[PDB]
Amino acid sequence: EVQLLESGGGLVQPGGSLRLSCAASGFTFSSYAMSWVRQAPGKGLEWVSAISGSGGSTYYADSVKGRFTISRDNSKNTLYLQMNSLRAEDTAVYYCAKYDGIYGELDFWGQGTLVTVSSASTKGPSVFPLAPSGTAALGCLVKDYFPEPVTVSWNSGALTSGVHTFPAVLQSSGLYSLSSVVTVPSSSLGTQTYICNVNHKPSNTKVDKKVEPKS
Amino acid sequence: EIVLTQSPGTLSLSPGERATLSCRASQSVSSSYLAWYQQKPGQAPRLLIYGASSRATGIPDRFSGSGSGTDFTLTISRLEPEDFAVYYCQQYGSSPLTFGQGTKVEIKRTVAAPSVFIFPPSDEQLKSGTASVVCLLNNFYPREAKVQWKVDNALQSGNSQESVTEQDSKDSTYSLSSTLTLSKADYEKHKVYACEVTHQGLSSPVTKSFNRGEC
Ligand SMILES: [Cl-]
């Protein structure tokens, strides 16, 4: 099966540089033109750059010309995007994608890697309880972290039913915040233990927060 | 560049029903070089249609495309559960290639009112000089709902943020989290913290509240 596996994304400084990689398998890589396409958070898809099969021809969007360089190493089955002079507006999920050799359209996309461009430092989240007071609701507020992402699980994965982990919001401070909630039998509140397991890998934060009724 | 406008922004339909999506170009698309992509949340785009009307290999019969010049159509004759996703059109006849803003095809189900819960800020957070108040609207349809914050009957503005989950795979509902952010000093100045919810599934608005400093 055809696969395109992306890597090299993460948090970087304005004016800084970053290199993305796209590892191709399951087809003769050197026979096809390749592309990078970006999706800024919550917005549309924007084509970034393209390269011929041999690497002899390269193409760029106006918004990245002179700063980004597309390249490939056919002996490694790898496509590259060298992003120099980065700006906040370059913040996006970046996709590598293959061009159809016969018909010309993009026919296969990689899963994408998040690139965040900001002067702000990595920051682990504070995790606060959302205490419960038929059906009861409880959760965890995961506040003031940077960059994305975090993961949340309940009771080390044992509790999944009725769980809603919300998309993070970006606050004016420039830090993210999300809630994760679960609805449970209100009779279970006294006997059953509820713990939210929060991971923020960029800051190596691991927090297990027990959520209890407050009196 | 060629601008692609898709309509409608959202389509609410039931499984088994017909879906018709429109993609209008600001200039004539060359040689019907227009593609349609499917994208599910957190996933890479998947090619459905190339050349305005040609099904990609592996794409089921139910998907078809038509059109020329400036007006293009994607048709899904009979919606399967897995067909509910975002759909983009894309022109590649004139560089740079460009994408429409996408049409979301959502499951239409019976009107369900939200279960509303309010959460006070924890004692732990209050030590940091900030108070976050959270309002949960659980398992509702349709997606539109209105949340008003009231602090001792005073309407709040400019100090809350919302996020909504993706449509639930089991019951087809949405959930919404709203967070009111106050300095501790402002939080301490008032008693009644209230979240007022307006929704189609409610005959009149639903208020959930608590008083600061009362078990
Ligand atoms: Cl080529």
mmCIF file with all atom_site columns, C-alpha atoms in Angstrom, chain B residues 58-151:
data_model
loop_
_atom_site.group_PDB
_atom_site.id
_atom_site.type_symbol
_atom_site.label_atom_id
_atom_site.label_alt_id
_atom_site.label_comp_id
_atom_site.label_asym_id
_atom_site.label_entity_id
_atom_site.label_seq_id
_atom_site.pdbx_PDB_ins_code
_atom_site.Cartn_x
_atom_site.Cartn_y
_atom_site.Cartn_z
_atom_site.occupancy
_atom_site.B_iso_or_equiv
_atom_site.pdbx_formal_charge
_atom_site.auth_seq_id
_atom_site.auth_comp_id
_atom_site.auth_asym_id
_atom_site.auth_atom_id
_atom_site.pdbx_PDB_model_num
ATOM 1  C CA . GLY B 1 58  ? -11.549 2.459  -5.238  1.00 0.00 ? 58  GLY B CA 1
ATOM 2  C CA . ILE B 1 59  ? -14.237 5.140  -4.898  1.00 0.00 ? 59  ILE B CA 1
ATOM 3  C CA . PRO B 1 60  ? -17.784 3.652  -4.692  1.00 0.00 ? 60  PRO B CA 1
ATOM 4  C CA . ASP B 1 61  ? -20.491 4.111  -7.369  1.00 0.00 ? 61  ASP B CA 1
ATOM 5  C CA . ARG B 1 62  ? -22.565 6.438  -5.159  1.00 0.00 ? 62  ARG B CA 1
ATOM 6  C CA . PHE B 1 63  ? -20.097 9.320  -5.682  1.00 0.00 ? 63  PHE B CA 1
ATOM 7  C CA . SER B 1 64  ? -20.290 11.229 -8.961  1.00 0.00 ? 64  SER B CA 1
ATOM 8  C CA . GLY B 1 65  ? -19.257 14.622 -10.281 1.00 0.00 ? 65  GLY B CA 1
ATOM 9  C CA . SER B 1 66  ? -20.323 16.835 -13.157 1.00 0.00 ? 66  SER B CA 1
ATOM 10 C CA . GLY B 1 67  ? -19.909 20.330 -14.570 1.00 0.00 ? 67  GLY B CA 1
ATOM 11 C CA . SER B 1 68  ? -17.729 22.564 -16.724 1.00 0.00 ? 68  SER B CA 1
ATOM 12 C CA . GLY B 1 69  ? -16.705 26.226 -17.013 1.00 0.00 ? 69  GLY B CA 1
ATOM 13 C CA . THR B 1 70  ? -17.500 27.788 -13.630 1.00 0.00 ? 70  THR B CA 1
ATOM 14 C CA . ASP B 1 71  ? -20.193 25.529 -12.161 1.00 0.00 ? 71  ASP B CA 1
ATOM 15 C CA . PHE B 1 72  ? -19.400 22.086 -10.690 1.00 0.00 ? 72  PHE B CA 1
ATOM 16 C CA . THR B 1 73  ? -21.370 19.513 -8.697  1.00 0.00 ? 73  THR B CA 1
ATOM 17 C CA . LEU B 1 74  ? -20.569 16.594 -6.441  1.00 0.00 ? 74  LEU B CA 1
ATOM 18 C CA . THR B 1 75  ? -23.385 14.110 -6.000  1.00 0.00 ? 75  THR B CA 1
ATOM 19 C CA . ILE B 1 76  ? -23.646 11.305 -3.454  1.00 0.00 ? 76  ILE B CA 1
ATOM 20 C CA . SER B 1 77  ? -26.715 9.351  -4.567  1.00 0.00 ? 77  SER B CA 1
ATOM 21 C CA . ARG B 1 78  ? -27.341 7.527  -1.277  1.00 0.00 ? 78  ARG B CA 1
ATOM 22 C CA . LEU B 1 79  ? -25.480 8.620  1.878   1.00 0.00 ? 79  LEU B CA 1
ATOM 23 C CA . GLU B 1 80  ? -23.710 5.909  3.889   1.00 0.00 ? 80  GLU B CA 1
ATOM 24 C CA . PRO B 1 81  ? -22.718 6.536  7.556   1.00 0.00 ? 81  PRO B CA 1
ATOM 25 C CA . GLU B 1 82  ? -19.042 6.919  6.514   1.00 0.00 ? 82  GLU B CA 1
ATOM 26 C CA . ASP B 1 83  ? -19.891 9.629  3.925   1.00 0.00 ? 83  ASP B CA 1
ATOM 27 C CA . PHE B 1 84  ? -20.491 12.280 6.580   1.00 0.00 ? 84  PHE B CA 1
ATOM 28 C CA . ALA B 1 85  ? -17.401 14.495 6.446   1.00 0.00 ? 85  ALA B CA 1
ATOM 29 C CA . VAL B 1 86  ? -16.073 17.718 4.929   1.00 0.00 ? 86  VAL B CA 1
ATOM 30 C CA . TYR B 1 87  ? -15.835 17.944 1.133   1.00 0.00 ? 87  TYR B CA 1
ATOM 31 C CA . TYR B 1 88  ? -13.500 20.266 -0.746  1.00 0.00 ? 88  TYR B CA 1
ATOM 32 C CA . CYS B 1 89  ? -13.394 21.085 -4.424  1.00 0.00 ? 89  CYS B CA 1
ATOM 33 C CA . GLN B 1 90  ? -10.068 21.963 -6.021  1.00 0.00 ? 90  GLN B CA 1
ATOM 34 C CA . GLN B 1 91  ? -9.031  23.372 -9.394  1.00 0.00 ? 91  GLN B CA 1
ATOM 35 C CA . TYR B 1 92  ? -5.697  22.456 -10.939 1.00 0.00 ? 92  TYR B CA 1
ATOM 36 C CA . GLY B 1 93  ? -6.130  23.665 -14.546 1.00 0.00 ? 93  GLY B CA 1
ATOM 37 C CA . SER B 1 94  ? -4.556  27.043 -13.741 1.00 0.00 ? 94  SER B CA 1
ATOM 38 C CA . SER B 1 95  ? -1.698  27.456 -11.272 1.00 0.00 ? 95  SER B CA 1
ATOM 39 C CA . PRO B 1 96  ? -1.510  27.863 -8.408  1.00 0.00 ? 96  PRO B CA 1
ATOM 40 C CA . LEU B 1 97  ? -3.967  25.039 -7.656  1.00 0.00 ? 97  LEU B CA 1
ATOM 41 C CA . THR B 1 98  ? -6.683  26.268 -5.264  1.00 0.00 ? 98  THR B CA 1
ATOM 42 C CA . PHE B 1 99  ? -9.282  24.768 -2.914  1.00 0.00 ? 99  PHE B CA 1
ATOM 43 C CA . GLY B 1 100 ? -12.804 25.801 -1.993  1.00 0.00 ? 100 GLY B CA 1
ATOM 44 C CA . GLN B 1 101 ? -13.538 26.470 1.680   1.00 0.00 ? 101 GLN B CA 1
ATOM 45 C CA . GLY B 1 102 ? -15.388 23.167 1.944   1.00 0.00 ? 102 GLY B CA 1
ATOM 46 C CA . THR B 1 103 ? -18.921 21.932 2.554   1.00 0.00 ? 103 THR B CA 1
ATOM 47 C CA . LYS B 1 104 ? -19.601 19.865 5.685   1.00 0.00 ? 104 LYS B CA 1
ATOM 48 C CA . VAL B 1 105 ? -22.084 17.017 5.346   1.00 0.00 ? 105 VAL B CA 1
ATOM 49 C CA . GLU B 1 106 ? -23.601 16.387 8.786   1.00 0.00 ? 106 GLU B CA 1
ATOM 50 C CA . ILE B 1 107 ? -26.110 13.817 10.094  1.00 0.00 ? 107 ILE B CA 1
ATOM 51 C CA . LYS B 1 108 ? -29.596 15.265 10.561  1.00 0.00 ? 108 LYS B CA 1
ATOM 52 C CA . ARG B 1 109 ? -31.370 13.671 13.520  1.00 0.00 ? 109 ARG B CA 1
ATOM 53 C CA . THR B 1 110 ? -34.225 14.529 15.905  1.00 0.00 ? 110 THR B CA 1
ATOM 54 C CA . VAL B 1 111 ? -33.956 17.711 17.983  1.00 0.00 ? 111 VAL B CA 1
ATOM 55 C CA . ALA B 1 112 ? -32.247 16.966 21.314  1.00 0.00 ? 112 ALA B CA 1
ATOM 56 C CA . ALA B 1 113 ? -31.961 19.504 24.138  1.00 0.00 ? 113 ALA B CA 1
ATOM 57 C CA . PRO B 1 114 ? -28.639 19.963 25.967  1.00 0.00 ? 114 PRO B CA 1
ATOM 58 C CA . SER B 1 115 ? -28.059 18.766 29.516  1.00 0.00 ? 115 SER B CA 1
ATOM 59 C CA . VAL B 1 116 ? -26.524 21.829 31.169  1.00 0.00 ? 116 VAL B CA 1
ATOM 60 C CA . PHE B 1 117 ? -23.913 21.823 33.946  1.00 0.00 ? 117 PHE B CA 1
ATOM 61 C CA . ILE B 1 118 ? -22.003 24.663 35.597  1.00 0.00 ? 118 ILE B CA 1
ATOM 62 C CA . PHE B 1 119 ? -18.591 24.245 37.270  1.00 0.00 ? 119 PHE B CA 1
ATOM 63 C CA . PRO B 1 120 ? -17.095 26.698 39.806  1.00 0.00 ? 120 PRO B CA 1
ATOM 64 C CA . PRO B 1 121 ? -13.356 27.470 39.727  1.00 0.00 ? 121 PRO B CA 1
ATOM 65 C CA . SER B 1 122 ? -11.321 25.144 41.959  1.00 0.00 ? 122 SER B CA 1
ATOM 66 C CA . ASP B 1 123 ? -9.568  26.349 45.127  1.00 0.00 ? 123 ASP B CA 1
ATOM 67 C CA . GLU B 1 124 ? -6.243  25.388 43.492  1.00 0.00 ? 124 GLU B CA 1
ATOM 68 C CA . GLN B 1 125 ? -6.703  27.808 40.555  1.00 0.00 ? 125 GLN B CA 1
ATOM 69 C CA . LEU B 1 126 ? -7.855  30.660 42.822  1.00 0.00 ? 126 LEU B CA 1
ATOM 70 C CA . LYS B 1 127 ? -4.362  30.577 44.411  1.00 0.00 ? 127 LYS B CA 1
ATOM 71 C CA . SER B 1 128 ? -2.925  31.649 41.016  1.00 0.00 ? 128 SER B CA 1
ATOM 72 C CA . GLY B 1 129 ? -5.021  34.855 40.870  1.00 0.00 ? 129 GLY B CA 1
ATOM 73 C CA . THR B 1 130 ? -7.384  33.659 38.109  1.00 0.00 ? 130 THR B CA 1
ATOM 74 C CA . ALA B 1 131 ? -10.855 32.098 38.164  1.00 0.00 ? 131 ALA B CA 1
ATOM 75 C CA . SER B 1 132 ? -12.210 29.971 35.325  1.00 0.00 ? 132 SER B CA 1
ATOM 76 C CA . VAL B 1 133 ? -15.947 29.215 35.312  1.00 0.00 ? 133 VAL B CA 1
ATOM 77 C CA . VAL B 1 134 ? -17.111 26.438 32.956  1.00 0.00 ? 134 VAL B CA 1
ATOM 78 C CA . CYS B 1 135 ? -20.505 25.690 31.424  1.00 0.00 ? 135 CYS B CA 1
ATOM 79 C CA . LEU B 1 136 ? -21.137 22.333 29.761  1.00 0.00 ? 136 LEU B CA 1
ATOM 80 C CA . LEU B 1 137 ? -23.892 21.757 27.206  1.00 0.00 ? 137 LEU B CA 1
ATOM 81 C CA . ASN B 1 138 ? -24.015 17.983 26.808  1.00 0.00 ? 138 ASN B CA 1
ATOM 82 C CA . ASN B 1 139 ? -25.320 15.946 23.850  1.00 0.00 ? 139 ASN B CA 1
ATOM 83 C CA . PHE B 1 140 ? -27.521 18.296 21.829  1.00 0.00 ? 140 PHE B CA 1
ATOM 84 C CA . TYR B 1 141 ? -28.811 18.703 18.259  1.00 0.00 ? 141 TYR B CA 1
ATOM 85 C CA . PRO B 1 142 ? -28.797 20.793 16.093  1.00 0.00 ? 142 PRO B CA 1
ATOM 86 C CA . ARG B 1 143 ? -25.343 22.390 16.504  1.00 0.00 ? 143 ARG B CA 1
ATOM 87 C CA . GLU B 1 144 ? -26.475 25.974 17.123  1.00 0.00 ? 144 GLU B CA 1
ATOM 88 C CA . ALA B 1 145 ? -26.903 26.958 20.763  1.00 0.00 ? 145 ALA B CA 1
ATOM 89 C CA . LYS B 1 146 ? -26.478 30.211 22.654  1.00 0.00 ? 146 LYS B CA 1
ATOM 90 C CA . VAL B 1 147 ? -24.660 30.630 25.966  1.00 0.00 ? 147 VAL B CA 1
ATOM 91 C CA . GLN B 1 148 ? -24.935 33.778 28.071  1.00 0.00 ? 148 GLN B CA 1
ATOM 92 C CA . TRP B 1 149 ? -22.894 34.349 31.219  1.00 0.00 ? 149 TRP B CA 1
ATOM 93 C CA . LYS B 1 150 ? -24.385 36.363 34.097  1.00 0.00 ? 150 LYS B CA 1
ATOM 94 C CA . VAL B 1 151 ? -22.530 37.548 37.193  1.00 0.00 ? 151 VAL B CA 1
#
